[PDB]
Amino acid sequence: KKKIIITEDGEFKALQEWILETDGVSLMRVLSEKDVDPVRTTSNDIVEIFTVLGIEAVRKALERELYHVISFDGSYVNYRHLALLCDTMTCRGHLMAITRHGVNRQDTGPLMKC
Amino acid sequence: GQSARDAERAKDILCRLEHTTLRKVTANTAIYYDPNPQSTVVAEDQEWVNVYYEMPDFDVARISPWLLRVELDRKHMTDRKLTMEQIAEKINAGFGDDLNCIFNDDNAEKLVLRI
Amino acid sequence: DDEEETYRLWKIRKTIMQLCHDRGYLVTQDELDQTLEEFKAQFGDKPSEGRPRRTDLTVLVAHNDDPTDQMFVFFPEEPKVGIKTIKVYCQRMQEENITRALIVVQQGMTPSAKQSLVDMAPKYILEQFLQQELLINITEHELVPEHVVMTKEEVTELLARYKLRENQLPRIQAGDPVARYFGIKRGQVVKIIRPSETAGRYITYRLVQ
Amino acid sequence: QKRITTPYMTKYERARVLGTRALQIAMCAPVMVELEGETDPLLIAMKELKARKIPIIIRRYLPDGSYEDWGVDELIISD
Amino acid sequence: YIQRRLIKSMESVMVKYDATVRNSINQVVQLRYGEDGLAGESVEFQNLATLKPSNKAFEKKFRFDYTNERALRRTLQEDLVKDVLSNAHIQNELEREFERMREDREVLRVIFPTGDSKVVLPCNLLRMIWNAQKIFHINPRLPSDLHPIKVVEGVKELSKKLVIVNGDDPLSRQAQENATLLFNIHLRSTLCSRRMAEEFRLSGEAFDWLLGEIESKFNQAIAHPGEMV
């Protein structure tokens, strides 16, 4: 969570900066306030980012959260699998959950829904 | 901005973002009965209500015999950098004009405003 | 107050001067970096009982490739907008011969007005916004990659290179924040350019339906 | 011409060519190499591949309906 | 239970014979598998070694100045040290590789903003140099006989024969440059003319072997058309 800058001589330097964390989400207003970074501020709920930021932002946020939950205990999983999952999960434009009535709404054949 | 560096501006924007209601900044409230603003049932609030009373405004229709008295806690007041001036206008500006707020001076230790 | 109100009107203005610059209109350079005190001196110090009336703020721009097609933006005065109030604007477009128009709604609109804009389909296309949404440029956020809209000559080059149809592309509905920021209609294809860690750069396409 | 596919025999086509050619040998088909004391119908079918002498053509189906035919002689054996 | 659900979702996605990852109804999901086109089985960790150093150490380690006449005499033979000092064309071509390197150094700093250097890539390069240093008994004590403009042109020709997206027209000649963008940067930064005349000190015979092996161990990392991805 540090602020990494590239100095004039060209070295990566990290800086400690105050960050704030809340309990409750309404991001469209928090972004509009003064002296609050509108670029790097984000929320851990993805339907909110879907309504506020778009669809590609949902793709990237979902990828980031999967990576963070996987690499929590020092484990590691290749990237292609995360990319393929979070791409087939947001392919038809909207957020369809991998659930009962999320795989129940597609151009699929009749002998699979039976 | 430098608010990311110094803790004071960080804390001020902290307080400016957090939600704060009224019951968090009040000590106790009491419904008294003053049929006249000069009656002053409680003993010591006569001073400031009177120094308002020699500047008497808004006696348009009547004077309501029913009073509402609110006590505030300066601990919870200053931590958010609030004082009852802004409260006084917004408790009016925002609800209507059906209410009327006179208040003390904060140099007095306890912060009371009567409505 | 008005200091909050003179701040917002400058901020919302600066956002729109980029939104129309993205769509390919001609906006003078210094209009993009119009600082606050410069705005405060030009249009007025305060809009509370002031010269900035939420009119005198409207903008009319012309396209780069063609000086005839122009776009207008309106800032309604009432919190929520009625029926003839937009027809006041529809008349203002009828007189000036402009079809591209925007309205920066203040707080909301009426369901009757929702009916009154979806009717003039073949002419006088208007976009309805909100005052809150225009307060921040979402395009410069971290998560949002770079979108670019492709002409209808380029789209026929994809479907002939990858030997695709147009049903087989990934889809995007024309109701999400970036589909409206660029003013996209159904049947268009937008190009996304994002950097990745395995290859370095990856270009994907979306069909807006 | 216009062959857009890879010149390498993929992992799956090598497992199906070796299976089919081995089953044809078991049913008395004529071999195409000079074996020496070999009897297993699947050991023979493997040294025919090392010599590029299996008489089978692969038809790759593109996902747009087309196809093209590669002779096993023309492919670069992966292993 | 959660794994059963998820696997019931994505059952029929696979790689079709034109290297596109298509659904069951042929709905394109990715234009290339994993955005690169390689199987996640023949890759491993490496380092860039171009983004982390400072602007002075960079120009100090990746420059190959040719006006010293004595260190150039120390590392190269006498046949080549008189040719490198007496040809403006060579000095010019040795000057443009540094320019093509600085641009990639600036692109890496925006691809990787945090500043790390651990990436996953195809065939290892430092181990392939270490192998060629022992298949040919390279003695890192004597002057070498590897002309630098040979290194430059050999790396160019090798970079040409690494096709992921085979085509000639635009929109198929720029997606190829987008696919193998990182690997080419790594390959150009590792096999530069200064480093391979200062540290590795490979001979002429031991360079064609390395070039021929890079290509052959890359072409077998590409994904196979038919695996149930």
Biggest CA pair distance of chain B: 56
- The domain of C195 spans 137-209
- The domain of D41 spans 1-79
Phi/psi-derived region of residue A84, left when phi > 0, alpha when psi is between -120 and 50, beta in every other case? alpha
C165 & C73 share domain: no
- CA B91 – CA B85 distance, rounded (Å): 10
- CA C127 – CA C103 distance, rounded (Å): 6
Q: What's the CA dihedral at E89, E94, E99, E103 to 10 degrees?
A: 130
C183 & C149 share domain: yes
Mutate: best of B2, B3, B19, partner A, most A CBs <10 A:
B3
Mutate: best of B9, B12, B15, B17, partner A, most A CBs <10 A:
B17
Q: Which helix (H) or strand (E) holds C74?
A: strand C70-74
Nearest to C175 by CA among A93, B99, E186, E41: A93
Residues of chain A with C-beta less than 8 angstroms from the C-beta of C198: 79-80
C59 & C93 share domain: yes
Q: Do C176 and A54 touch (CB under 8 A)?
A: yes
* Strand duo B69-72 + D57-61: pairing: unpaired
Helix, coil or strand: residue C158: helix
C98 & C152 share domain: no
C41 & C144 share domain: no
Structure tokens at A4: 């990494």
Q: How was this structure determined?
A: cryo-EM
DSSP C43: T
Q: Do A84 and E229 touch (CB under 8 A)?
A: yes
Nearest CA in chain D to E23: D63
C116 & C183 share domain: no
Nearest CA in chain A to C194: A56
C129 & C82 share domain: yes
- Nearby residues of E43 by Cβ (< 8 Å), 6 or more positions away: E120, E121, E122, E221
The answer to whether C186 and C174 have CB atoms below 8 angstroms apart is yes
The CATH number of whichever domain residue C86 belongs to comes to 3.40.1340.10
Give one DSSP letter per residue of B9-42, joined into a string: HHHHHHHHHS---STTSEEEEE--B-SSTTT-SS
Query: Position of tokens 């129940």?
Result: A104
Contacts 24+ apart (CB under 8 A), D24-28: none
Name all chains with 3 or more CB-CB pairs below 8 Å to chain C: A, E
φ and ψ at C154, to 5 degrees?
Answer: -75, -35
Counting CB pairs under 8 A, whether chains D and B reach 3 or more, is no
DSSP C8: H
- CA E100 – CA E107 distance, rounded (Å): 11
A22 shares contact with chain C (CB less than 8 Å): no
φ and ψ at A100, to 5 degrees?
Answer: -70, -60
Nearest CA in chain C to E27: C168
Q: H-type helices in E32-167, by residue range?
A: 55-61, 71-75, 78-84, 88-111, 126-135, 148-160
Nearest to E35 by CA among E123, E112, E156, E120: E120
Nearest to A54 among C177, C197, C198 (CB): C177
10 Å CB burial of residue B4 (0-12, 13-18, 19+) is: middle
- CA A55 – CA C171 distance, rounded (Å): 10
Structure tokens at D56: 């089978």
The crossing angle, in degrees rounded to 10, of helices E182-190 and E148-160 is 160
Q: What's the CA dihedral at A92, A96, A98, A103 to 10 degrees?
A: -70
Could you tell me how many residues make up chain D?
79
Nearest to C132 among A28, A42, A83 (CB): A28
φ and ψ at C171, to 5 degrees?
Answer: -110, 155
- CA A13 – CA E207 distance, rounded (Å): 38
Sign of the torsion angle spanned by Cα atoms C17, C22, C27, C31 = positive
- CA B55 – CA B48 distance, rounded (Å): 11
The answer to whether C45 and C9 have CB atoms below 8 angstroms apart is no
The answer to whether C193 and C201 have CB atoms below 8 angstroms apart is yes
Among C136, C164, C188, the domain-final residue is C136
Nearest to A6 among E6, E40, E109 (CB): E109
C106 & C186 share domain: no
C-alpha angle with apex C110: C109 to C115, nearest 5 degrees?
A: 110
Query: Position of tokens 């161990």?
Result: E217
Q: How far is CA D4 from CA A14, C80, D66, E187, E216, in A?
A: 49, 59, 11, 27, 20
Other CB atoms within a 10 A radius of the CB of residue E134 amount to: 9
- Cα–chain center distance at E149: 17
10 Å CB burial of residue D47 (0-12, 13-18, 19+) is: middle
- Cα–chain center distance at B24: 13
Counting CB pairs under 8 A, whether chains A and E reach 3 or more, is yes
The CATH number of whichever domain residue D2 belongs to comes to 3.90.940.10
The answer to whether E144 and E75 have CB atoms below 8 angstroms apart is yes
C2 & C101 share domain: yes
- Nearby residues of A4 by Cβ (< 8 Å), 6 or more positions away: A12, A13, A14, A15, E113, E114, E115
C73 & C2 share domain: yes
The answer to whether C31 and C17 have CB atoms below 8 angstroms apart is yes
- CA E166 – CA E120 distance, rounded (Å): 24
φ and ψ at B25, to 5 degrees?
Answer: -120, 10
Structure tokens at D36: 């020496």
Structure tokens at A66: 């999967």
Structure tokens at A17: 């900066």
- CA C109 – CA C128 distance, rounded (Å): 9
- CA E2 – CA B49 distance, rounded (Å): 69
Q: Which helix (H) or strand (E) holds B98?
A: none
Structure tokens at B1: 């901005």
C-alpha angle with apex C135: C129 to C141, nearest 5 degrees?
A: 105
Give one DSSP letter per residue of A65-104, joined into a string: HHHHHHGGGS----HHHHHHHHHHTT-SSS---SSTTTSS
Nearest to D7 by CA among D79, D67, D65, D78: D78
In chain C, the number of structural domains is 2
C150 & C121 share domain: no
Give one DSSP letter per residue of C88-146, joined into a string: HHHHHHHHHT--EEEE--SSEE-HHHHHHHSS--SS--EEE--TTGGGS-GGGSSS--E
Q: How far is CA B21 from CA B71, B76, B100, B101, E95, in A?
A: 15, 11, 20, 18, 69
In chain D, the number of structural domains is 1
Nearest to B82 by CA among A29, B29, B91: B91
Helix, coil or strand: residue A113: helix
Q: How far is E166 from chain D (nearest CA, A)?
A: 8
φ and ψ at C191, to 5 degrees?
Answer: -110, 130
DSSP E168: S
Q: Which residues pair with B114 in a beta bridge?
A: B69, B102
Q: How far is A3 from chain C (nearest CA, A)?
A: 14
- CA B80 – CA B75 distance, rounded (Å): 9
Biggest CA pair distance of chain C: 62
Phi/psi-derived region of residue C24, left when phi > 0, alpha when psi is between -120 and 50, beta in every other case? left
- CA E219 – CA E203 distance, rounded (Å): 25
Helix, coil or strand: residue A26: coil
Identify residues after which chain B is interrupted (C–N over 2.5 A).
none
Q: Do D61 and E224 touch (CB under 8 A)?
A: no
C118 & C143 share domain: no
